Design a protein around this nucleic acid. Structure first.
Ligand SMILES: [Mg+2]
Ligand SMILES: [Mg+2]
Ligand SMILES: [Mg+2]
Ligand SMILES: [Mg+2]
Ligand SMILES: [Mg+2]
Ligand SMILES: [Mg+2]
Ligand SMILES: [Mg+2]
Ligand SMILES: [Mg+2]
Ligand SMILES: [Mg+2]
Ligand SMILES: [Mg+2]
Ligand SMILES: [Mg+2]
Ligand SMILES: [Mg+2]
Ligand SMILES: [Mg+2]
Ligand SMILES: [Mg+2]
Ligand SMILES: [Mg+2]
Ligand SMILES: [Mg+2]
Ligand SMILES: [Mg+2]
Ligand SMILES: [Mg+2]
Ligand SMILES: [Mg+2]
Ligand SMILES: [Mg+2]
Ligand SMILES: [Mg+2]
Ligand SMILES: [Mg+2]
Ligand SMILES: [Mg+2]
Ligand SMILES: [Mg+2]
Ligand SMILES: [Mg+2]
Ligand SMILES: [Mg+2]
Ligand SMILES: [Mg+2]
Ligand SMILES: [Mg+2]
Ligand SMILES: [Mg+2]
Ligand SMILES: [Mg+2]
Ligand SMILES: [Mg+2]
Ligand SMILES: [Mg+2]
Ligand SMILES: [Mg+2]
Ligand SMILES: [Mg+2]
Lengths: 59, 49, 50
RNA sequence: UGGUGGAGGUCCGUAGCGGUCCUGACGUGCGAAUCGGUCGUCCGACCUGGGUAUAGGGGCGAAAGACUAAUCGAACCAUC
RNA sequence: GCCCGGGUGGAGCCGCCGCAGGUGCAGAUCUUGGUGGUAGUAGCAAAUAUUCAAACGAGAACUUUGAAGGCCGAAGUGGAGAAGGGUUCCAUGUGAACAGCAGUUGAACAUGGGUCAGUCGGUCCUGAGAGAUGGGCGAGCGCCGUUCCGAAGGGACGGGCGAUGGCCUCCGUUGCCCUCAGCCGAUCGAAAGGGAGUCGGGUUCAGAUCCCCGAAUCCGGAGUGGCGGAGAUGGGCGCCGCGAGGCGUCCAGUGCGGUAACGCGACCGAUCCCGGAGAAGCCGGCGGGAGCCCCGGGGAGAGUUCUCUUUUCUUUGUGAAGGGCAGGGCGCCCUGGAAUGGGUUCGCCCCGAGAGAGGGGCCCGUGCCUUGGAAAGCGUCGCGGUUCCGGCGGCGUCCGGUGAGCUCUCGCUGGCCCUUGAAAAUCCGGGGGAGAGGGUGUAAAUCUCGCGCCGGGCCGUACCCAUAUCCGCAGCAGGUCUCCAAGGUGAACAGCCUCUGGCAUGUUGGAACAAUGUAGGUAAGGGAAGUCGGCAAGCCGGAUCCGUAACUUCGGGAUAAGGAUUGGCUCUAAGGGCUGGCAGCCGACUUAGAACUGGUGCGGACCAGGGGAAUCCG
RNA sequence: CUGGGUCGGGGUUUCGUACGUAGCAGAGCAGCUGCUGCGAUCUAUUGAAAGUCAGCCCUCGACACAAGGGUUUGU
């Protein structure tokens, strides 16, 4: 995901959990050379990423 | 895609010359550049003795 | 430098974002006098101050 | 007398630092001070990075009026 | 100066009477802009070097692939960082401009991508220093000053009062009182100082100690603490029971062992006090351990095979964290008491303030074995997915020896100082003994022991790091801080050649080989007659064995000066370890002597002091 | 039916005696009971081998080539 530079890892985890009613294993955040924060969100093993991406709209 | 073999750099020549030096060749007073102490330190000699 | 501060990185990001050329639909508006981007900066020529 | 030991602002000499001579090259140059051979020193008053202090009639100077951002027998900037 | 004609042009302009002025250019090394001759000229010459074939393409000296010949030569033209740069990184596309020739190429242009951390750093500490308040000064913005002309603590074990919540039990939350007591001065100051804790394998076009897999680890937290184990369960008496074992009274129980160094899995404890670690220079010598190099073999795969070569080359392993054992060190302990002095080092040094000789203890154990761990990695041979695959299979990853060898690291010991070579954060041990627990048990308080539960937020992370990504106006022969470091020769990290890795000759090529240049050489006879002046060039040069003057501050002068030798090959002699005056088995480089031999040549390239006699000055 | 050119062959000349083979030549050394190996060098083949126009001399040997191409010029 792309998030704003004012978000903690805890905030990103909570936002994903509320929005997409899923579980998050961990979060890794970096700040792109162009300015916004990029977040890699690793889900729980019992959730697969492909179906969540389906529900999102990106396939 | 093959990994080419390493170009040969043999040691047969230098090991044959080393065998000659073992026998005592090429070690005359003509073929030596350092001092006697530099070639074989007298302190080390005395230590061993 | 690999070690850099947050504000330095943000300023660099803004400067990098500013370096794109103009959109092709600009030059054929009506009240337009712009032919190209005249503020483009190359890293070899001008050294960004700092 | 023979060993041993391993001192030293010690000697030859690399790396490093410096810059003698050719008054060589170049001299609208590679370069607003470089290049080549040859040179001085190379464990100590040694060489060097970063941090920090000293600001213009002031600083700093193993002292040449030297250095103080290619600017120094008084820096640079703006104004009068 | 002006009026007409012709042409171009496309929207304003002039005559006369007055009024007003920023009103007339050939120059001012005038200002700005433009353009010539020079001139298709100077020039595109620092660091050895390129050639053949094919492909793509309109187009090839410069692109790509293959082959050949070269260079860098481990103090690199290699592999990574710091500062600085800031998208230059990666993929695709283009060839207008730029890359001083060209380009199918680019650090150019155009589209898109790319930097993932509890453990790597910042973040914290303080250093040299910087800087508020109090105070002082100052017309004033302000300045001085950093403990100095200050009521500088907003904390706490515990006790008492008052209220609340939770089974109001016991504790928490406060509010008040009693009691307890320093600060070296707020705060800032290091991406090289201090600073707990992450390693291995795999993966991308570009990211990995960060992603995935697998093994760990530090810190912090937890009403009921989740749990084990420790604190712990004994003795006496009266008994019962044949005894085993079981009852009723008393008493103890904040662990135990070793003579000792000290050991064991824990083994209560506050304010306070003491100490340690953090926390220390430069140089020398020696020893231990790794990595590398080296030698003799087993494999596996390659190279040569005109002749020879049991041949030449490549490869042949195990992380962190535990456990054990080597191996190093001890200014640690016990017995005993030594001259006929002894022990011992390369050197030293040690001993009635207790040596030798026995027996122990402690610390580091980065080495070996094991858990990890063969399951992974790698080298080969063969099958698959005709591919999109951490694909599947066989085999192997073995045995030894040495070294004043190089680098790193640990340790011992000494030398030098009119030089004595940081602070704080943080952590730990001890001395004390204020307190707490229970009355014999369901034991309690308390545990730095074992396992178990939860979490670790924020920022940086791509690439260059330099004869093209930095600074010099630039792809500038300049400058710019570091780590890694093979073989041969050789004293050597010197010079020269080569391997791993890299590169295409430094912003162009072809053909000629005049003068004059720049940079190298060689010259008959003479030998400084040249020149201001032996400027430049030239002679000498390493090592071994002889020999070495005047003068002297007695240390030097000194490599003084001056001589001889140096190759190749075949021998001899001497210099050691381990096991059982001796015997056997291994072995690493040296030194000396001799013979033979070459067209007198032998430090054969490279490296590599000309000398002497005096004067002046310091 | 002539020409040069390339290659080859001779001549000249430079250097100094090639590789291989053989040797009861070789300071010596090791192994097997006189023989076999290592061994710098030496002797014979060996005035040998190699080079020799690119700006040397002759060839009458071989090979292919050579009756071309372009631009101009009138009293
Ligand atoms: Mg630049
Ligand atoms: Mg000296
Ligand atoms: Mg000159
Ligand atoms: Mg000139
Ligand atoms: Mg010297
Ligand atoms: Mg002053
Ligand atoms: Mg003067
Ligand atoms: Mg003045
Ligand atoms: Mg108009
Ligand atoms: Mg006007
Ligand atoms: Mg004019
Ligand atoms: Mg020209
Ligand atoms: Mg490099
Ligand atoms: Mg690199
Ligand atoms: Mg690129
Ligand atoms: Mg060009
Ligand atoms: Mg991890
Ligand atoms: Mg102040
Ligand atoms: Mg700080
Ligand atoms: Mg730090
Ligand atoms: Mg003793
Ligand atoms: Mg395996
Ligand atoms: Mg990187
Ligand atoms: Mg060249
Ligand atoms: Mg070139
Ligand atoms: Mg260049
Ligand atoms: Mg050039
Ligand atoms: Mg002469
Ligand atoms: Mg002569
Ligand atoms: Mg004269
Ligand atoms: Mg001279
Ligand atoms: Mg003298
Ligand atoms: Mg005199
Ligand atoms: Mg002097």
């Amino acid at each position: 995901f792309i998030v704003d530079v004012k978000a903690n890892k805890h905030q990103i985890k909570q936002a994903v959990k509320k929005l997409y009613d899923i579980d998050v294993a961990k979060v890794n955040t970096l700040i792109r050379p162009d300015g916004e924060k990029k977040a890699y969100v690793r889900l729980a093993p019992d959730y697969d990423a492909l179906d969540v991406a389906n529900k999102i709209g990106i396939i | 895609i093959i990994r080419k073999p390493v170009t040969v750099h043999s040691r047969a020549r230098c090991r044959k010359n080393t065998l000659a030096r073992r026998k005592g060749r090429h070690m005359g007073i003509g073929k030596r550049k350092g001092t006697a102490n530099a070639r074989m330190p007298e302190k080390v000699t005395w230590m061993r003795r | 430098s690999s070690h850099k501060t947050f504000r330095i990185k943000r300023f660099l990001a803004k400067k990098q974002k500013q370096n794109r050329p103009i959109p092709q639909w600009i030059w054929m508006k009506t009240g337009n006098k712009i032919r190209y981007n005249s503020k483009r900066r190359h890293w070899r020529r001008t050294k960004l101050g700092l």
